[PDB]
Amino acid sequence: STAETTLDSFFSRAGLVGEIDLPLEGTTNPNGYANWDIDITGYAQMRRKVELFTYMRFDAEFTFVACTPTGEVVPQLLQYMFVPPGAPKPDSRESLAWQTATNPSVFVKLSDPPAQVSVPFMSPASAYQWFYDGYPTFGEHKQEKDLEYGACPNNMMGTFSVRTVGTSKSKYPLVVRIYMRMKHVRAWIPRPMRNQNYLFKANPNYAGNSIKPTGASRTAITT
Amino acid sequence: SIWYQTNYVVPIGAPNTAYIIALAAAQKNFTMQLCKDASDILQT
């Protein structure tokens, strides 16, 4: 059977994509909240996988597993807010973004099972694309510089704003691990698979000291 | 106008210069009108 090599099976599984620390004291997230832009490549092996193709469509199932750094389950109420592409993110814990109805919020207890939601295909284009040979629109005129190269902006998927419910800081140190699973995957235009280490998140730049894929051989004649 | 698109390519043993001969003629829609005798020099 060949159902294991379908694209759906190839991306099928749910992987850790982000961790959110909400400590009692510290410099990390002092205001008891965090904004997490949806990053497909949070799961390490995912980027190279996904970059096997040029264009892709998919749904995303997000699951939120919360606990304390010891894995302890505590009586705390959380809010998972999905800030859509184009909506302004909360800048404080008292921001009015937290109560904007058009930002879907999920209210779960840490006692409850992990929260779970589906995100549709958010792009205004017909497909996400991991490669964009060109500078972003509008065109031209000059433009401002070359800095913008290789950045497709239609890949924007949204943002998850994670906070503890309430006006007072939580009594518990929390960690919110979020898992993403790709649904209904389609992909176009196969590409050669990355064989050099990645350097930056938004471009294919590589170290000027490049390596072979492998080469454990002395001469072509000896195995 | 005749332009070099590519360089002239030869293997070893072939001469490095060659000649083009240009031949010209008129097509069947060609016509001439007002006759006019005018040439060189007769029998010196």
Binding site: - | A18, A24, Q27, N29
Partner: protein, 49 residues
């Protein structure tokens, strides 16, 4: 040099289409590409290929 031009010397006005066929007489092993361009009257000689 053409018989055409010499027959034009015996007339005053003429009009029509012309054919110029080029023949390459290099060795059989020689190869390459030429660009032969026609510029209509009034137009200047093209500055580059």
């Amino acid at each position: 040099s053409t018989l055409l031009g010499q027959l034009c010397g015996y007339y005053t006005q003429w009009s029509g289409s012309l054919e110029v066929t080029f023949m390459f007489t290099g060795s059989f092993m020689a190869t390459g590409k030429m660009l032969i361009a026609y510029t209509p009257p009034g137009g200047p000689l093209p500055k580059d290929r």
